[model samples]
Target: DLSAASHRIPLSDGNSIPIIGLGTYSEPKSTPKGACATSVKVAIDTGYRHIDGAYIYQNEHEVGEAIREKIAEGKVRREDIFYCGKLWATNHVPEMVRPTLERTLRVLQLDYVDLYIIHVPMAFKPGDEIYPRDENGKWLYHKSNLCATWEAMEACKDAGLVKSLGVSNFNRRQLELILNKPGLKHKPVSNQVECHPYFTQPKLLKFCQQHDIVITAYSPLGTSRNPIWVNVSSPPLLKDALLNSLGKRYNKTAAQIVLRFNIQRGVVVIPKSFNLERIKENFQIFDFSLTEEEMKDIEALNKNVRFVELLMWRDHPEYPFHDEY
Candidate 1:
């Protein structure tokens, strides 16, 4: 049970996440039946104990089944495996907060999630549609009292619906808003964000470190290049000559080098992959070590770029990327 805990993934709240995880987010259209479940199964079998998911992914039922099936099959006990769930923008309103988590649990059929995070700082119209847009195709923005939303999240943690509470895509100002809230019960234990060498996030990472918040990095090996949501114009991180040359020096793939680079910095990584071979490849980073100079070289690769830019919501009042991290 403490295997993941001892892997440099400690939470400020006395919990520990696995250093490496399997990201379960995928384009809904491309994800077929059991694809997530199958990936989860494969990831677990490949020694990945952490599974990152989101209610917005619309595949929780299948991902849940994969977890349950793994437990039933004796591959891992519920405690051995860690699951991270996300609260979408529409549910940021205080009233819909716990209710939305409950809906995820109901669909997931799990009593409690290991971690639950606010998916983003932006709040959309509270409704059944995930993305609430007007007929003219404008985002129906909601004015969210984020502190109130944090209170509701704290209540869910108190109610045992979640073991740890965190935030995602949150910039420093947004984090300070909740951290500075007068009656804050449980401060965010972690901040999930799009991080890779291209956007090294040194400032935010250092800030979170100073505040004792672990940064759970998504797209650690770079994104899947999903044309719809990801910006294809940016150069791919894996294709960097420096990463590839270092990969040769370490006898690892560029992906493994990048993952190790993050893990070495105490950042938790969840690289999404459904391919059996890649899933296994990503988990092999624990075996290698990156020297300080090498780590610094990788840090110098920072372009201050973000591939997962939530640009559509940029004009929203609570849009997070506007400020310097």
Candidate 2:
């Protein structure tokens, strides 16, 4: 059986990451000012030690405030919580890597994050604009090599700005580029990706496992509310008949069954919700185990559907979705 508060998977760098975390990416209309901070406090009080945030989310300061408040109240010590942040595309320049991390640290009000990840394999032009564009409204990209960015990330780890370094949205070929780089100082500990029952990513999961790189799953419950990235016509994963029936049989909710299925496959899941009741309900998946038959039944729902597709960046030289896995 699994336990939410105590279950942690070992990383390649000898650190352990919690199996489940509170994802802090709030949609525009859904999150008002100060709401992120309140949600962070609720999650921590509800027994979530791992909190995931990123610069692109635009709520780091609020998250920092909640963490500080919890620490002041003696609810959780600084070391007891595992915080993860990401380096944005605008800061992929070799010289800008550390500076961007410093900015993120300042906003979070933390000396060091447990893990710092490269937000995406793609790079954007260095400037104030998060997404730079040319005269014709096309996306402007930086010409720096990905290996150089990795070198700067290595320097951040060496300086103790972060404990572990990883990547997000990288495919097998992209991973191999870093793994085979010369003078590599640190191997990526995890790869954060879009995964769910509809898109199991069997081959990608197997590749990560073979190299001892953990897969941290984002959008595990499907991207139903992500209108910016996902089309409104996308089918819902929570309402699937198989998941609904399994939830009834196990005395759990469909969301809980979806999360537990990922956990059983050795992938870490981060589900985002600011609602207090939902936050508490999400943490209640530790006490049950899915039988072999149940696991197989859930596996039958895989259709390789991806909810968080970065199709606009398809023409970029480093686009990762062309190959299988």
Candidate 3:
């Protein structure tokens, strides 16, 4: 009964998503082979049902192994877990879509994923290079036909390769492209983006809500350890005097306060942590409630900043942060 994973929010597609999920992306250099697997097992033991991972993370095998172990141990059933996988940017072409997903399934050794999303709005040159930059370190941007890519996503849904379809880092304009696509079969069930108290995403959240798309927040704690970039100029969010002060009143950590703030607003959060104590602390948020006044205070703290800006790909036509979301 203490498990926070029991909290589920219904998505537009009639599928329910756990309000809180474990973000499993890690920096490749620091990630030991079994670290992610151990984190996932601990997360499940701590009552986390949703596991957010990506093909580009290069750690699906670890995440999958943890899930498989827990299932075999009777700690959870596959149906009880909401496993989310994402399509990387390079394989945006229509023909490459199924093959990309098939590769993920093969690596995961699972029949189907609960949710599959476009990892980012931009498309890179289709090949081994994840970043796909030119020799001089310029980005190799491929012209993307998102509508055609979406057709392939819809096909996957029809064929049951994935139970739900969504996108990550898509702005209002990009989302509109999918929502208004010709012969659209299934609309996106959710949109995952960098959302936290610092960059609260008010305009984008309202737009997705109006369209019945749930917003799954990534890095909901503002920034992560050794993140690709953090404007050190901007003060750390968890260290904010206000959130720390509020945490004292609620007998919780500053992280719990901001996390509860987002969940209270119905934004699903997937905070990543491989540390056991932090994973438990992250999931222990469901026990508390943030007052309306507290929520407003957190909202007012938004500086409209981004913590995970992929600066190298700024010129890509699909670079989402250029738009004021």
Candidate 4:
């Protein structure tokens, strides 16, 4: 089993995570009933141990079904997998934390998750709508303190619901807020963010590393197929000349090169794909290694561009992207 190149990175909490994971978020057409389950099964069979999911994804049951089937079939045991889930904005209030996590566990059909994260820094109104809004359609935000939310997250770990806790889409300052918060029980083990060749995030990555917080890169291939958030004019990352050239030189695909670049830099990459072939192909990065010069050449492709900007949140008091980081 260790021959699959399934390398694990040690976390501050004495836990470990796989370097590469199969991202489960996809569009409706891409994720029909049982599609995600089949994809998850295929990914696990192909050597992916980390499965990234969120409450907002609305597909945890499918993902959980795959895990359950795999465990029943004896292909993988519950302890052999790493399940990550998020706490959505609407459940940021202190009292809502435990119930929200309990509901997530019920949906996942798991006794505990390997890791749990705060989905975002902002808070929305608690309700059925993930993005609860006013009659005029503006976002209905709750002004609850983020520290209170972090305390609740710590409680989740203490109650044996989650093995580790982390944050997502948080900037350096926001991370500092958590790190410096008085009576902090547990430091976040990782910070998940949007990272790729175009949006290298060198400073933030360095900062997280300095603080012993791992960076989990989401949309590592630029997410060109994401129509809802990505604009039509955005360039495709898999088609970049530099990446393609490197791919050709190494006799690999551009997507593989991009993934290897992040892994080589100690960043965890989660590339989403539902096609079985592509899912298998995404895990083939560990067989090859890039030279120092090649790694630097890829680094030159950084333009500090991001694909998943939620500009509507810019006005929120705790909005995290204003600084250069």
Off by over 4 Å in 1: 1-8
**Model 3 — which ten-residue stretch has the worst lDDT?**
224-233
TM-score of each: 0.97, 0.97, 0.97, 0.97
Error of 3 at 168 (Å): 0.5
User: What are the per-residue Cα lDDT tens digits for candidate 1 across 1-325?
Assistant: 1232245367989988888899988888877878889999999888888899988888899889999999998988998888999989888888888999999999999999999999998888887899999999998998978899999999999999999999999999999999999988999999999888888899999999989999999989889888778888888889999999999998999999999888888889999998889998988887678899999999999989898887998898888888988
- Compared with the true structure, the alpha-carbon lDDT of candidate 4 equals 0.89
Clash pairs of candidate 2? none
C-alpha lDDT of all candidate models, in order: 0.89, 0.88, 0.90, 0.89
TM-score of 1: 0.97
Q: Give the least accurate 10-residue stretch of model 1, judged by summed lDDT.
A: 1-10
Model 3: how far is 137 from its true place, Å? Answer: 1.1
Q: Model 2 compared with the native: what TM-score?
A: 0.97
Q: What lDDT tens digits, residue by residue, belong to model 2 across residues 130-176? A: 88999898989777488999999999999999999999989999899
RMSD of each: 1.7, 1.3, 1.5, 1.6
lDDT by residue (30-94, candidate 3, tens digit) is 77889999999999999999999988898999989999999999999899999999988899999
Error of 3 at 250 (Å): 0.9
Model 4: how far is 31 from its true place, Å?
Answer: 3.0
